[PDB]
């Protein structure tokens, strides 16, 4: 839900915070999907792609 | 024992032909002898295989 653009003003530690918050979110809605009370399915994909985006930006910061 | 350790002279392959011109494959092997030569003037000896051509030409010092 957040463009990779506005992830470049965030430092390493707060990018890491964003990433762990997102991983916790993903665990929660994975449980909700398993128990049957998640109707919105595209939420899983968006959060999974957000995690991938956060790693991508971190690696780009490391290398250049 | 058919490769020289110095010049790599290996066997050659040809035919042994009988009186009935009955050719069979055989090998001309090199005349490699077990030499035990020195690399240093001092005289420490290491055992190798050297064809008699290399012995004759003095490529190995059996000091």
């Amino acid at each position: 839900g957040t463009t990779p653009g506005e992830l470049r003003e965030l430092t390493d530690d707060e990018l890491k915070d964003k990433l762990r918050e997102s991983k916790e979110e993903l665990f929660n809605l994975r449980f909700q999907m398993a128990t049957g009370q998640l109707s919105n399915n595209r939420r899983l994909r968006t959060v999974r792609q957000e995690i991938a985006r956060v790693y991508t930006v971190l690696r780009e910061r490391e290398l250049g | 024992a058919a490769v020289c350790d110095i010049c790599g002279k290996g066997p050659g392959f040809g035919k042994s032909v009988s009186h009935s011109h009955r050719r069979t494959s055989r090998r001309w092997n090199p005349n490699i002898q077990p030499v035990r030569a020195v690399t240093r003037p001092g005289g420490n000896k290491q055992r190798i295989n050297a064809c008699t051509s290399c012995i004759k030409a003095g490529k190995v010092s059996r000091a």
Partner: protein
């Protein structure tokens, strides 16, 4: 830079008659990563839900071979952790009861 957090290990809860019957005795079944061990699972479960975990028992289940006009295919091979919580009995309520 990878970050490893506990939730990357446990994937789904097992929602079944037997799983609920164990829940009623304060024992929780999860689907876990196929390459985990009981020590890692215990640490992760204690770190996520903030409980004391007594025991973890693991089972490996092979995938069901299903037929088709093409032939056979196979499902995932999964492994499950049955986790027994301490006597304090602070329930875990992400299962729906």
């Amino acid at each position: 830079a990878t970050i490893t957090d506990p939730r990357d290990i446990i994937l789904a809860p097992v929602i079944s008659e037997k799983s609920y019957g164990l829940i009623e005795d304060n024992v929780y079944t999860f689907v876990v990563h196929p390459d985990s061990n009981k020590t890692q699972i215990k640490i992760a479960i204690e770190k996520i839900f903030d409980v004391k975990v007594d025991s973890v028992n693991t089972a490996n289940r092979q995938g069901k071979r299903k037929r088709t006009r093409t032939g056979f295919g196979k499902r995932k091979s999964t492994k499950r952790a049955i986790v027994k919580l301490a006597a304090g009995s602070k329930p875990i309520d992400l299962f729906g009861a």
